[PDB]
Amino acid sequence: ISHGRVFRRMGLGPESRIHLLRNLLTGLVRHERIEAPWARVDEMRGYAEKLIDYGKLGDTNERAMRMADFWLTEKDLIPKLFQVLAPRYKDQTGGYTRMLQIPNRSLDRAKMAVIEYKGNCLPPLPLPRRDSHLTLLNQLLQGLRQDLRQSQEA
Amino acid sequence: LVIPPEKSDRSIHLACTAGIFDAYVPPEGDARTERMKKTMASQVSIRRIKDYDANFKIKDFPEKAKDIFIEAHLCLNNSDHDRLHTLVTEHCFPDMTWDIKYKTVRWSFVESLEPSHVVQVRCSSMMNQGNVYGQITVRMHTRQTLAIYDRFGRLMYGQEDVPKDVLEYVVFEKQLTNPYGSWRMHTKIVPPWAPPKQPILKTVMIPGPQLKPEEEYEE
Amino acid sequence: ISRKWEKKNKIVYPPQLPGEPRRPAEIYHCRRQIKYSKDKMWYLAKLIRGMSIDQALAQLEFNDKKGAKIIKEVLLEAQDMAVRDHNVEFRSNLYIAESTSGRGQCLKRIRYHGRGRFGIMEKVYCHYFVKLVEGPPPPPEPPKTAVAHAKEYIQQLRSRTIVHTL
Amino acid sequence: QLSPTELTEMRNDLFNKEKARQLSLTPRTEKIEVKHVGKTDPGTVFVMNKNISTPYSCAMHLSEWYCRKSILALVDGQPWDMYKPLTKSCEIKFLTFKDCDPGEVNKAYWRSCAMMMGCVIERAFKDEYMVNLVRAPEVPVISGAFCYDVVLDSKLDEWMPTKENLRSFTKDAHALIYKDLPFETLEVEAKVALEIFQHSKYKVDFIEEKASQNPERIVKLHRIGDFIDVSEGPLIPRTSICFQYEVSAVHNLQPTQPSLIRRFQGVSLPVHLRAHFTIWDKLLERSRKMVTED
Amino acid sequence: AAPKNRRTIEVNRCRRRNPQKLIKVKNNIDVCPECGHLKQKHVLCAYCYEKVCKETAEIRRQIGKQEGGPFKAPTIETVVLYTGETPSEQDQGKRIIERDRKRPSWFTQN
Amino acid sequence: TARGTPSRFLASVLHNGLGRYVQQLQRLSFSVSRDGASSRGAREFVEREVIDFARRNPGVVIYVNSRPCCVPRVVAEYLNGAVREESIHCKSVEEISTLVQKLADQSGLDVIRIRKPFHTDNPSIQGQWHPFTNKPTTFRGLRPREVQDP
Amino acid sequence: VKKGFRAAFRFQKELERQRLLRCPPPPVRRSEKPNWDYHAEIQAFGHRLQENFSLDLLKTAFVNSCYIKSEEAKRQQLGIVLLNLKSNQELSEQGTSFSQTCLTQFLEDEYPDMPTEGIKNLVDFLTGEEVVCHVARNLAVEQLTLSEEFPVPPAVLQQTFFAVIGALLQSSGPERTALFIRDFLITQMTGKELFEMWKIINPMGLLVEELKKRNVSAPESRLTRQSGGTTALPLYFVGLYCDKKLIAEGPGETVLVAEEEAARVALRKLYGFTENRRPWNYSKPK
Amino acid sequence: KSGTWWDEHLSEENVPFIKQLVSDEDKAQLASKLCPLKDEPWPI
């Protein structure tokens, strides 16, 4: 029975899970976009969002500095968090990353994801896009919407 | 079939050469000063051919060549590859039979629109390797019928009853030094000005560049 | 060993008469001595039986089994073979008419157990066989309907004789 | 004059004969070179048979994916039926319902559905009555329903179809979809079509209009099964493209005095863009409103 | 526990070929409109993802050449410029990564 | 097996015996050796039996071919197309005589299981039984428990 | 490798039999197989039947026009008259015509209430390709037939069969030839129901016409017996009544089927071609 | 033959519009039932 259990059992135990998630998060902060097994990226995604919020507290916040020092195992990334990444997301309140499934890994056929901080300098990922508004279906719906708007005014 | 045999007192004895000694360039519009010089070299070479066979008559050859041509092309209808090796050279046998290993050929000789005319005679460099070859180019202008069927017996090219005119410049070669040598088809000169062959029956897709992800398409 | 599958592309049919319908092209291809169980290969060979060439390539491209990539390599060179050497017109106008695995020649190794015991380990090899036929894939046979059942039942009722009498 | 069945058999014979005639104009195989200029598979040349190979033949060279998705072809920048034989070396692109601007595919599908309704209307009523198809108005897709103007018998000037009757039209249309009939086309000279549509006055009036705009006075014909009609442009390849199809409403146009023109309306979606049952109902309801083209 | 009896091929064929053990046909495969290669609907295109990864690797090799050592992540944003491009007004004060090729049509200058 | 073999019903060829009787054996082909010991009795049959058998059987064509053979054989052919090969290897003249007569009396139908020891195309003359054969009919053909004159 | 020869030889014979079953060879003419003397085969043909054929006539009855035309084509192709062979065209016409009148005489005598349409259809059935080719194949006719393409086409086999009847008519006369037709064509009716040989449509139409000619009231269809009316396997008996008198009843799964069946039953009874009718007398006239 | 879900083919613009449309319809279907006794109830 695992009702309401919100975290995965990964690595070699609970400290090992954190150390795995920390190593992944450190890589995401350096490279802005990493690929890794899908469930670990899913598990790590929550922490990557929380790290930005601590960065938005500022480097003079002792608690945020203590949090960043734990989570970023390469220390040049601590100034990057507070001075690059967090100012990039000052307007946003959330949704700092995007995560996408990529094809299964060749060797072990593992389900995989790519995760990135939004607004990075890398070539854009080939994101999925909704059908154009000009398709047959979307033009019939567009007509429906405007007909309503006309009758709504009445 | 991969590597030529190595150094030995025994070597490969060839019965033909690789190409045309002097490539008769068919003058533009031969469908229907220097000219004198041409006949000189041919005359010099008919002499060297008679230097091995006194009885060789350049006047009777056009008719011999015609029979060789027809007989060679009637083997391709029965895949009689033993006879064919007598009528054509080892440089030519692959060119007539490789693309029809699993096809059915129906070829016919209908008529000769003009008598065949020997248009060049050239011999090989004296004592090349103890072997002397003599090549006779013959212009033929005939009507042939050709229908090629595929492995499954479906018409793949040509028509089986419609004769069409064919203008060919067929080179024959003999090994003069060889006591058992004979006159055999050696190749076919194709004039650049020759009209294009009839279209095949099926459609084709010529593929484009197979791009790697990194690579982009240059128009 | 036997290598009969490789000789089936060497059959030459006589030219068809003008009235006969076009004979479809048939391309036999195989790959010998794959490092894979024939039993596992069987499922991929079964998967694509009756598919269009393109359906089979699609289904194998997104399969996780090692056998899928090998069968996909075989299917693509058999498709190339078909249009280049067997006078097929459209490379997509092909379907899997036959698709099966066979046992390869296998090796034997020692597997060590405890207490000085051991088993004999068979390093396994298989063959994949595919026959492509020109044309659209044949439609799947419709499921038997209640009408066809009733017709067949009544037919059995009408064929019964009087048994063991005059 | 000719009976309805006879008038149908006459038209096909003239159609079949004209189809054979244009075929005889190129007896020997002639090869055209079609360059592919879509984003995908770029640089492929199709060496096709002039006046025999259609855009579908090139799609068959690429893959079954092209064949299923390609609703229309763009031959030298002009919309071209997938089954309209190619006539010269050209550049070819294929068009799908899910392109970034499928405007022309939408029109092709839209007049293809009106043609399917005309085929249904013509054969729906009893032989006692006289169904004279008039026109397929070119209404925008965003209007919400494809239309077909028809003049029914004058005994029927008080009959308006019931909901069960509209379902009968719909069930007949779905029979056409289940037949999976290709949309066959012919570009004939106005004189040839006027012979086919000699009996029908409205078609003669329409055919004359279409010949007028073109210098060569060439008109486009299409046929599905035994039904022939005059078209405004390219159609889709087959009737099986349609998935959701319904004849929604019938509106008597005005002024009724000269002749009661009855606008049949329908809405459809192809298999590629099938809508949810709930969304399909909202579209069915708006299609029942009268479409009033300019 | 050991088998009391050999299982016949008829019993084993009923187990091995059971529809539960058969591979299932996938119905979420489609063509990528950008490149024409196949993909699953919910997964990114393998071909288009590789194209993006090859260029990301090239840009990252350039970032490596500039930083020139470990623990030298900069404290400013980065921009990638291609041959024939110049820093805009909003790219002042950013680390510039120069790529010796033309900007790909898909990696738009935003 | 019976379950391991084919079977048939009792039959004749072209209703033989009905208008007239036709001998169904039409041909016999012997292959005897001139010298082989196996053909000693098949030589004796050819000497003193085959001629008298031919005269009794004018409708049968007999073909005796003398050739080197280790196994003398007779081959019977019948009007229905049947071909039956019988070895006469090391059979005496009297055994071969009986064998040949056996072949002459046969029809050429398969010697397999016959399902019934009789055949008739007219099994009934009065009418085949059916569930109503012995049932009496009732006034107005009314069904059981049926209200009349509704 | 084991010593010996016998098992190897015996195994070779079994591999050879399997190849034949795997790849059966194309059928050839019996004349093109060993042990064939055309002249002796012809004489055996006549003796089997207890007939005094004229070997000259019998020999031509087997020569067909398609064969002589082809035999000459071979002669010209090989550059090789003595082939002035008369075909059986004439001999067939005599046999075919005699056969029709002989069968008509036989059938009209035995079934004097069968209409002319019925008797004509019986004669067409008894002289049809189906029965004649069956009877010919089982009398060694096709083995002796000189034809162009083998297996002998049924039209050619039917011509040859009546050519042999014509040869018997010239050789032995009509009375002897009538007896041959009784023994090989009349026999092919045995077992057969009337309308298995005479294919009719709407037997209820015919029954009315036949009863009108006989000045009998039009039949009334009535349900004589019924079972399982509402089930998928009903039984119906329909009785036909003329002047409130039953003339026939028929079973069926539907009333429409049982009614048409009753009409076929009534026709069988009217025409004197019932299943319990007197059998054909094949006894030699005394 | 492939599967489809309700918003698969909808555009960025039509998805919010369709959700509002279906939600508004439901709320009004529920509001139309709030007076059973004025709508010809069955015998009480």
From Swiss-Prot, chain C:
One of its GO terms (cellular component) is mitochondrial inner membrane. One of its GO terms (biological process) is mitochondrial translation. Its main location: mitochondrion. It comes from the Eukaryota. One of its GO terms (molecular function) is structural constituent of ribosome. It is found in: Mitochondrion. The keyword Transit peptide applies. The keyword Transit peptide applies. Keywords: Mitochondrion, Ribonucleoprotein, Ribosomal protein, Transit peptide. Belongs to the universal ribosomal protein uL22 family. Component of the mitochondrial large ribosomal subunit (mt-LSU). Mature mammalian 55S mitochondrial ribosomes consist of a small (28S) and a large (39S) subunit. The 28S small subunit contains a 12S ribosomal RNA (12S mt-rRNA) and 30 different proteins. The 39S large subunit contains a 16S rRNA (16S mt-rRNA), a copy of mitochondrial valine transfer RNA (mt-tRNA(Val)), which plays an integral structural role, and 52 different proteins. This is Large ribosomal subunit protein uL22m. It comes from Homo sapiens. The lineage of its organism: Eukaryota, Metazoa, Chordata, Craniata, Vertebrata.
Curated annotation (Swiss-Prot), chain E:
Zn(2+) binds at residues 32, 35, 45, 48. The keyword Transit peptide applies. Residues 86-110 are annotated as: Disordered. GO terms for cellular component: mitochondrial inner membrane; mitochondrial large ribosomal subunit; mitochondrial matrix; mitochondrial ribosome; mitochondrion. Component of the mitochondrial large ribosomal subunit (mt-LSU). Mature mammalian 55S mitochondrial ribosomes consist of a small (28S) and a large (39S) subunit. The 28S small subunit contains a 12S ribosomal RNA (12S mt-rRNA) and 30 different proteins. The 39S large subunit contains a 16S rRNA (16S mt-rRNA), a copy of mitochondrial valine transfer RNA (mt-tRNA(Val)), which plays an integral structural role, and 52 different proteins. bL32m has a zinc binding site. It comes from Homo sapiens (Human). This is Large ribosomal subunit protein bL32m. The chain holds residues 79 to 188 of 188 of the full protein. Belongs to the bacterial ribosomal protein bL32 family. It is found in: Mitochondrion. GO terms for molecular function: RNA binding; structural constituent of ribosome. Component of the mitochondrial large ribosomal subunit (mt-LSU). The mitochondrial ribosome (mitoribosome) is a large ribonucleoprotein complex responsible for the synthesis of proteins inside mitochondria. Keywords: Mitochondrion, Ribonucleoprotein, Ribosomal protein, Transit peptide. One of its GO terms (biological process) is mitochondrial translation. Residues 91-103 have a biased composition (Basic and acidic residues). It comes from the Eukaryota. The keyword Coiled coil does not apply.
Curated annotation (Swiss-Prot), chain F:
Component of the mitochondrial large ribosomal subunit (mt-LSU). Mature mammalian 55S mitochondrial ribosomes consist of a small (28S) and a large (39S) subunit. The 28S small subunit contains a 12S ribosomal RNA (12S mt-rRNA) and 30 different proteins. The 39S large subunit contains a 16S rRNA (16S mt-rRNA), a copy of mitochondrial valine transfer RNA (mt-tRNA(Val)), which plays an integral structural role, and 52 different proteins. Its main location: mitochondrion. It is found in: Mitochondrion. High relative levels in skeletal muscle and testis. Lower levels of expression in the heart, brain, placenta, lung, liver, kidney, pancreas, spleen, thymus, prostate, ovary, small intestine, colon and leukocytes. Expression is coregulated with TWNK. Keywords: Mitochondrion, Ribonucleoprotein, Ribosomal protein, Transit peptide. It comes from the Eukaryota. The keyword Acetylation does not apply. This is Large ribosomal subunit protein mL43. One of its GO terms (biological process) is mitochondrial translation. The keyword Ribosomal protein applies. Belongs to the mitochondrion-specific ribosomal protein mL43 family. One of its GO terms (molecular function) is RNA binding. One of its GO terms (cellular component) is mitochondrial inner membrane.
Swiss-Prot record, chain H:
It is found in: Mitochondrion. Disulfide bonds: none annotated. Component of the mitochondrial large ribosomal subunit (mt-LSU). Mature mammalian 55S mitochondrial ribosomes consist of a small (28S) and a large (39S) subunit. The 28S small subunit contains a 12S ribosomal RNA (12S mt-rRNA) and 30 different proteins. The 39S large subunit contains a 16S rRNA (16S mt-rRNA), a copy of mitochondrial valine transfer RNA (mt-tRNA(Val)), which plays an integral structural role, and 52 different proteins. It is linked to Combined oxidative phosphorylation deficiency 9: A mitochondrial disease characterized by failure to thrive, poor feeding, hypertrophic cardiomyopathy, hepatomegaly, and psychomotor retardation. Death in infancy has been observed in some cases. Belongs to the universal ribosomal protein uL3 family. This is Large ribosomal subunit protein uL3m. It comes from Homo sapiens. The lineage of its organism: Eukaryota, Metazoa, Chordata, Craniata, Vertebrata. The gene is MRPL3. The chain holds residues 44 to 87 of 348 of the full protein.
